[PDB]
Amino acid sequence: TQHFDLIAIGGGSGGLAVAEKAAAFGKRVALIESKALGGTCVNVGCVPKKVMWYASHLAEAVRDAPGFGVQASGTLDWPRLVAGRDRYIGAINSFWDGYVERLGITRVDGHARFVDAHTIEVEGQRLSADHIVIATGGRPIVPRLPGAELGITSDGFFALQQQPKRVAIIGAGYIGIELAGLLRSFGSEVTVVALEDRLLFQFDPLLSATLAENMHAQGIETHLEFAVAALERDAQGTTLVAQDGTRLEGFDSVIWAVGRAPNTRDLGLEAAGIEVQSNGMVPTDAYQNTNVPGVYALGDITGRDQLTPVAIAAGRRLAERLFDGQSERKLDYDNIPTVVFAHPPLSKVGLSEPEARERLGDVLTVYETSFTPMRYALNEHGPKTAMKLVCAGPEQRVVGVHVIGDGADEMLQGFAVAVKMGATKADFDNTVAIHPGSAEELVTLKEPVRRPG
Amino acid sequence: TQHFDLIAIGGGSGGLAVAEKAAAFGKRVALIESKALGGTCVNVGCVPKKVMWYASHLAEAVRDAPGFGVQASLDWPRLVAGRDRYIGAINSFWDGYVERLGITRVDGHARFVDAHTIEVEGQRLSADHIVIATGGRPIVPRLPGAELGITSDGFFALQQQPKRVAIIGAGYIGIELAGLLRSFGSEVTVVALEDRLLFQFDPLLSATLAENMHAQGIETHLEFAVAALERDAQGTTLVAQDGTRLEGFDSVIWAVGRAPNTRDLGLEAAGIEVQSNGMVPTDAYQNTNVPGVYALGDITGRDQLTPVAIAAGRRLAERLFDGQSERKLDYDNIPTVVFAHPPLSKVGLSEPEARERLGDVLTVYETSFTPMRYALNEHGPKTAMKLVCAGPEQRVVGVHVIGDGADEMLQGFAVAVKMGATKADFDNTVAIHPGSAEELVTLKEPVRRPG
Numbered sequence: 050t051q052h053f054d055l056i057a058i059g060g061g062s063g064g065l066a067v068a069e070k071a072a073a074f075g076k077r078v079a080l081i082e083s084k085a086l087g088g089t090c091v092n093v094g095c096v097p098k099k100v101m102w103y104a105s106h107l108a109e110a111v112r113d114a115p116g117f118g119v120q121a122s123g124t125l126d127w128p129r130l131v132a133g134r135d136r137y138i139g140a141i142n143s144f145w146d147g148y149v150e151r152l153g154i155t156r157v158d159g160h161a162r163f164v165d166a167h168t169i170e171v172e173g174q175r176l177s178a179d180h181i182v183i184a185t186g187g188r189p190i191v192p193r194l195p196g197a198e199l200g201i202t203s204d205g206f207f208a209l210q211q212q213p214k215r216v217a218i219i220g221a222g223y224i225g226i227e228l229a230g231l232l233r234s235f236g237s238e239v240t241v242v243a244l245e246d247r248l249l250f251q252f253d254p255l256l257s258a259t260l261a262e263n264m265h266a267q268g269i270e271t272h273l274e275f276a277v278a279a280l281e282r283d284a285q286g287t288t289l290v291a292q293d294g295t296r297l298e299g300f301d302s303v304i305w306a307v308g309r310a311p312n313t314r315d316l317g318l319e320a321a322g323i324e325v326q327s328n329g330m331v332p333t334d335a336y337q338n339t340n341v342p343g344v345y346a347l348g349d350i351t352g353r354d355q356l357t358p359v360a361i362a363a364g365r366r367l368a369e370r371l372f373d374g375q376s377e378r379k380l381d382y383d384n385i386p387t388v389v390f391a392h393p394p395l396s397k398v399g400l401s402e403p404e405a406r407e408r409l410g411d412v413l414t415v416y417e418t419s420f421t422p423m424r425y426a427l428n429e430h431g432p433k434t435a436m437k438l439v440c441a442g443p444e445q446r447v448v449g450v451h452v453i454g455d456g457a458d459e460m461l462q463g464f465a466v467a468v469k470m471g472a473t474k475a476d477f478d479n480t481v482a483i484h485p486g487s488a489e490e491l492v493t494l495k496e497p498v499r500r501p502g
Numbered sequence: 503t504q505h506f507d508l509i510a511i512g513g514g515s516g517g518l519a520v521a522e523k524a525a526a527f528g529k530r531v532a533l534i535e536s537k538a539l540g541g542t543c544v545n546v547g548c549v550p551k552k553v554m555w556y557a558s559h560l561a562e563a564v565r566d567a568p569g570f571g572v573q574a575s576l577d578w579p580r581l582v583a584g585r586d587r588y589i590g591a592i593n594s595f596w597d598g599y600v601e602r603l604g605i606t607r608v609d610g611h612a613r614f615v616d617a618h619t620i621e622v623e624g625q626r627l628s629a630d631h632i633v634i635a636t637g638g639r640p641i642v643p644r645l646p647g648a649e650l651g652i653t654s655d656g657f658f659a660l661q662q663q664p665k666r667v668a669i670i671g672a673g674y675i676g677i678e679l680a681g682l683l684r685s686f687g688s689e690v691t692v693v694a695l696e697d698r699l700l701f702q703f704d705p706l707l708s709a710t711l712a713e714n715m716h717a718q719g720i721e722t723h724l725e726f727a728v729a730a731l732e733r734d735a736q737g738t739t740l741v742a743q744d745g746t747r748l749e750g751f752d753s754v755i756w757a758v759g760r761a762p763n764t765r766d767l768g769l770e771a772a773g774i775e776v777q778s779n780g781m782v783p784t785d786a787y788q789n790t791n792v793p794g795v796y797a798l799g800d801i802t803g804r805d806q807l808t809p810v811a812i813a814a815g816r817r818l819a820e821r822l823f824d825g826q827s828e829r830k831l832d833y834d835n836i837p838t839v840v841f842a843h844p845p846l847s848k849v850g851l852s853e854p855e856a857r858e859r860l861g862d863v864l865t866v867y868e869t870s871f872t873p874m875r876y877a878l879n880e881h882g883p884k885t886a887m888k889l890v891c892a893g894p895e896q897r898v899v900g901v902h903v904i905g906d907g908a909d910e911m912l913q914g915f916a917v918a919v920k921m922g923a924t925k926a927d928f929d930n931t932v933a934i935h936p937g938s939a940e941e942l943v944t945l946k947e948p949v950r951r952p953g
């Protein structure tokens with residue numbers, strides 16, 4: 050009750066990771082979870098998203114099969130997809146429940162709040178530890194706009210027991226785009242709106258442009274620089290009213306996909322004297338330390354890369370640092386690879402061209418290519434893959450790799466290793482190609498499209 | 503007719519690469535080709551194989567679709583027609599491109615007449631530099647009834663799907679053809695002289711491939727040496743050299759390797775060293791024993807891969823024609839994919855190879871799992887991976903994967919391995935989640951250590 054080496058607040062990606070490594074170094078660990086182990090990723094995030102992504106991937110494959118001479122009819126049993134998805138997620142949840150007990154971790158059910166710098170209270174029970182790690186994650190934002198409650202979030206999406214016929218998605222970051230692709234692939238009408246002048250604004254403009262092309266060809270309708278002012282009920286759905294009065298209208302499902310807020314609202318951060326930003330993010334140093342000794346934060350609430358393996362690595366490294374004498378141990382937050390699971394997917398590691406220009410000079414040599422992979426050889430209008438290599442300095446060190454198209458979801462993990470090693474263009478070009486496939490295009494880029502100046 | 507800087511013999515992967523790069527350095531180039539530009543890879547190799555592999559991949563996708571709630575369900579003539587049209591366009595591209603580059607195309611079979619002269623149907627041509635890139639052809643054993651079987655060439659000539667196939671040889675061609683034929687619903691049995699499939703590959707890959715192929719209903723016979731092929735009722739029979747008789751096969755495919763096209767090439771007349779097996783020895787810079795004569799591609803007996811021919815061809819032209827006197831291909835750590843169902847890929851050394859070259863210095867990491875691809879299917883193939891690391895620093899000397907996504911997974915890892923990546927380099931790389939590649943950077947605790 051005060052003899053814990055560690056309290057991890059939150060049994061999500063970060064919390065599980067720190068608790069597991071700490072328990073593995075023989076430490077006495079308490080883990081607090083108000084909902085389900087696995088957090089957002091397992092229950093309402095990565096896993097259910099990717100399972101549904103496989104279904105839309107197979108639906109595309111059935112559409113494309115006749116072109117290759119493979120007989121295939123062609124329609125989604127949404128209830129069946131949800132049933133198999135939840136069974137799959139359930140088993141992952143059950144694994145973590147059993148594993149947390151196998152590790153000897155003290156599981157505490159309920160919502161934790163700090164009471165002071167080294168103590169939390171959960172449903173009236175106070176607990177202290179030498180180390181308290183905050184990993185409470187986030188939740189979808191619903192803007193404070195008229196009729197906003199007529200909309201649903203990604204949480205409500207994964208709760209849908211039937212497929213909606215006519216979807217409006219508000220926001221074109223990861224989840225907006227991912228959900229758009231899933232739903233349109235299942236044959237829903239899909240419109241996405243976004244405040245920005247292009248989809249996936251945080252990504253390289255070549256990826257935004259090619260994604261826009263692929264989505265248009267899929268029959269997804271898009272509205273750019275479209276600011277939602279309100280939602281209103283019409284006959285047969287809800288409408289979407291823009292700042293300028295434009296009405297969209299008729300959607301049986303409107304999904305808010307406009308970001309995530311950190312679960313730090315009543316965590317008793319004030320009581321413990323822990324610094325927090327107006328946006329609810331908890332500042333940390335490179336070693337996940339808050340301003341209060343013995344208090345750490347990781348995962349989504351730290352305001353850095355909002356990804357599960359970032360939460361996990363940050364957690365594992367912290368436990369190595371605190372409990373295994375590895376005093377210099379920390380996560381490098383540069384060159385973290387990611388995939389956006391559009392149809393076809395995209396992936397990147399490092400800097401987009403404009404980011405690279407912002408952080409570095411015009412020292413940029415940029416290589417790119419577009420092509421139709423052999424995956425669509427015997428189809429009429431397959432999506433074109435696009436790739437960009439962002440290189441910097443006279444030695445053309447690779448500072449960004451960007452890909453959208455078939456196979457992109459498994460392509461870049463190894464390129465992330467090379468980039469973290471400081472690969473140059475020479476390192477890339479001296480690597481023999483694998484043929485035939487798409488990844489070879491990344492090591493056989495010849496003429497740059499842009500050079501310094 | 504003698505003012506050529508370059509003669510490339512063979513318009514396949516290697517010849518095209520050297521000719522193209524030399525022509526781009528402003529050189530005067532002659533290209534000799536007896537058949538079709540693009541060589542084996544374009545016409546009867548990588549490209550048709552991969553096209554058919556996509557069909558097979560889509561057949562599996564339709565099999566698996568209902569498990570994910572997606573309703574579903576081979577017209578082989580239609581596959582053949584689309585494949586040939588696709589191949590055709592690549593041929594046509596190279597024909598026009600060779601013309602575009604200003605290369606002098608010579609149709610027909612070249613032979614050396616002396617150290618710096620070839621003759622093609624009576625016409626002699628000399629050049630400062632002659633590059634031999636004549637490729638190979640499928641081996642048909644000299645055994646009774648061997649002519650009853652066909653080769654990979656005959657496979658790609660098939661206008662109808664055969665019902666009951668025997669595949670002889672379990673190198674990459676045999677395994678690949680077995681996989682697509684069985685996904686198309688043919689009966690398939692593969693036989694092999696060795697005690698496991700894909701003997702050149704890591705044993706973890708051979709074993710899980712064996713597992714996947716068995717689950718897909720492919721029948722295999724290991725340590726099975728065919729003595730003869732005999733005609734039976736309704737097909738042809740494999741007779742082993744212990745009397746074992748196999749079946750009434752629609753199609754018997756020899757896939758026991760490829761021989762180099764160097765038999766009738768005038769190599770003797772030019773004084774060019776050539777091995778009893780027909781391979782042409784070269785130094786690290788593609789040089790033969792005679793100055794001004796080079797060999798690249800399959801006939802050099804190194805990695806029998808199209809990108810190896812290409813890179814070797816391109817580097818040679820840089821060396822000969824752009825003053826890059828030290829330019830050469832590194833033949834270490836060449837990545838490859840075997841297009842089984844699911845595919846496999848490797849770069850670097852298998853565990854036994856690494857043992858032999860490096861000794862008892864290996865830290866080996868393995869994992870097996872069922873990727874999320876088969877989450878809602880009943881019996882998906884399990885992915886398996888091995889990291890072969892060496893020394894105290896655990897330098898990554900081999901990366902091995904079989905399973906879904908393996909065909910696009912390792913090109914990046916090949917760059918890292920070329921850079922001398924260690925296990926620390928891998929582990930310090932943040933995983934992408936969810937997918938399979940992340941398992942390669944999250945291997946914890948080795949299965950074997952030195953000793």
Ligand SMILES: Cc1cc2nc3c(=O)[nH]c(=O)nc-3n(C[C@H](O)[C@H](O)[C@H](O)COP(=O)(O)OP(=O)(O)OC[C@H]3O[C@@H](n4cnc5c(N)ncnc54)[C@H](O)[C@@H]3O)c2cc1C
Pocket residue numbers: 058059060061062063064081082083084085086087088089090091093094095096098159160161162184185186187203224312316347348349350354355356357358360934935936
């Ligand atoms: C729709 C969607 C798709 C995504 N797809 C991917 C993807 O493909 N790849 C990827 O890498 N990431 C993906 N993510 C992001 C990823 O899920 C998060 O970055 C990850 O879950 C962050 O881990 P975390 O530990 O910070 O928080 P979480 O995993 O959200 O865990 C926090 C936990 O703390 C609990 N909690 C909160 N407050 C308290 C309290 N005070 N007391 C006790 N418990 C508390 C919560 O119930 C939750 O279980 C996706 C996210 C979403 C929403």
Ligand SMILES: Cc1cc2nc3c(=O)[nH]c(=O)nc-3n(C[C@H](O)[C@H](O)[C@H](O)COP(=O)(O)OP(=O)(O)OC[C@H]3O[C@@H](n4cnc5c(N)ncnc54)[C@H](O)[C@@H]3O)c2cc1C
Pocket residue numbers: 483484485511512513514515516517534535536537538539540541542543544546547548549551610611612613635636637638654675763766767798799800801805806807808809810811
């Ligand atoms: C079934 C199969 C599948 C394959 N799959 C892959 C794969 O997926 N990935 C990969 O990297 N590799 C693959 N390969 C191997 C790849 O095709 C070869 O390694 C590559 O073609 C070798 O290039 P090359 O220049 O040495 O020979 P080739 O491409 O075979 O070219 C040699 C050319 O020379 C011509 N020629 C021969 N003699 C003469 C003469 N004296 N005069 C004029 N012309 C002559 C021939 O007609 C031929 O066009 C595959 C091969 C096969 C057979």
Ligand SMILES: [Cl-]
Pocket residue numbers: 105106109391392393394
């Ligand atoms: Cl897809």
Ligand SMILES: [Cl-]
Pocket residue numbers: none
């Ligand atoms: Cl145990």
Ligand SMILES: [Cl-]
Pocket residue numbers: 160172
């Ligand atoms: Cl409460």
Ligand SMILES: [Cl-]
Pocket residue numbers: 311312313314315
């Ligand atoms: Cl909260």
Ligand SMILES: [Cl-]
Pocket residue numbers: none
């Ligand atoms: Cl031109």
Ligand SMILES: [Cl-]
Pocket residue numbers: 611623
């Ligand atoms: Cl002749």
Ligand SMILES: [Cl-]
Pocket residue numbers: 762763764765766767
């Ligand atoms: Cl010959």
Ligand SMILES: [Cl-]
Pocket residue numbers: 558559562842843844845
């Ligand atoms: Cl496949």
Ligand code: NI
Pocket residue numbers: 050051052053177
């Ligand atoms: Ni205690």
Ligand code: NI
Pocket residue numbers: 165167168177
């Ligand atoms: Ni106290």
Ligand code: NI
Pocket residue numbers: 503504505506628
């Ligand atoms: Ni001449």
Ligand code: NI
Pocket residue numbers: 616618619628
């Ligand atoms: Ni002479």
